[PDB]
Design a protein around this ligand. Structure first.
Ligand SMILES: NC(=O)c1ccc(-c2cc(-c3cccc4c3OCO4)cnc2N)cc1
Length: 285
């Protein structure tokens, strides 16, 4: 097939970046953009657009344009750094300092999502993007297809139960902690980043993946982890908690000693303004 006329009218299409995502240039500015093509479905995209449109944060990808045609076309900011996945696959591993910098941004982003009643639900290295090929860069969270937006129970809670089934009243205990699955995921990501390997795999083990994850008994290889700070590992331990009510929240993660690191925050602050130079309007003194 070919690209929709309306797309072609504003953009020039180029090479594939992943798979699908294509490189493209905006005609008006000659600036580079990324276009994620989603083949026809309707629902994931409806919410994804609605979410991207409303969100406004440095560590969350922005939407630039949208095309509802033979397929779905979503125009996004281009991340030249590529995926985080590509930085950690094949037991590659990030220096602890880069992990902190990246994870801190992930935390702010996800904190931001939660503050705004949105749960990502699909956090992985491939949905974290780097802004440049420098290992010091901004990261942005991407791919909100699987996100949820946060009352049925709450309404049911307003009547005399009496006809109200037991299992429902039992769900009140945990209701409202769905966001914790993102904290789990963050935990698994931080592990991978620091160690170069996954906490729960089927590589060289006879216990099922399901069993590992429900038990929380992750694969700890001291040879590798000795290189890593105890603070770092401590924070991982608090995110990989099986009980969602006990699990670390983004706030608790951000207050964790491993992140009280003024140098790292500085570098991130420096990277922020460096990106904003482009848009910086003059302002009132
Ligand atoms: N699944 C998503 O929603 C999503 C959207 C866009 C991007 C994205 C990818 C890339 C990219 C990926 C691999 C290699 C590269 C890339 O750019 C330069 O070389 C860049 N920008 C993006 N916004 C990823 C996931």
């Amino acid at each position: 097939s070919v690209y929709p006329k309306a797309l072609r009218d504003e953009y020039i299409m180029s090479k594939t970046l992943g798979s699908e995502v294509k490189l493209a240039f905006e005609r008006k500015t000659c600036k580079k953009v990324a276009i994620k093509i989603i083949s026809k479905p309707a629902l994931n995209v409806e919410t994804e657009i609605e979410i991207l449109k409303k969100l406004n944060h440095p560590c969350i990808i922005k939407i630039k344009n949208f095309f509802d045609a033979e397929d779905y076309y979503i125009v996004l900011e281009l991340m030249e750094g590529g995926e985080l996945f590509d930085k950690v696959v094949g037991n590659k591993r990030l220096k602890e300092a880069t992990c902190k910098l990246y994870f801190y941004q992930m935390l702010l982003a996800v904190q931001y999502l939660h503050e705004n009643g949105i749960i990502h639900r699909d956090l992985k290295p491939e949905n974290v993007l780097l802004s440049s090929q420098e290992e010091d860069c901004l990261i942005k969270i991407t791919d909100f297809g699987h996100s949820k937006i946060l009352t049925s129970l709450m309404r049911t809670l307003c009547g005399t139960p009496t006809y109200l089934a037991p299992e429902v009243l039992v769900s009140v205990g945990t209701a409202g902690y769905n966001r914790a699955v993102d904290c789990w995921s963050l935990g698994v990501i931080l592990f991978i980043c620091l160690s170069g390997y996954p906490p729960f795999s089927e590589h060289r083990t006879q216990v099922s993946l399901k069993d590992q994850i429900t038990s929380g008994k992750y694969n700890f290889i001291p040879e590798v982890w000795a290189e890593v700070s105890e603070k770092a590992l401590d924070l991982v331990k608090k995110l990989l908690v099986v009980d969602p009510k006990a699990r670390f929240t983004t706030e608790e993660a951000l207050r964790h000693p491993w992140l009280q690191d003024e140098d790292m925050k500085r570098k991130f602050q420096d990277l922020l303004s460096e990106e904003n130079e482009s848009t910086a309007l003059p302002q009132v003194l």
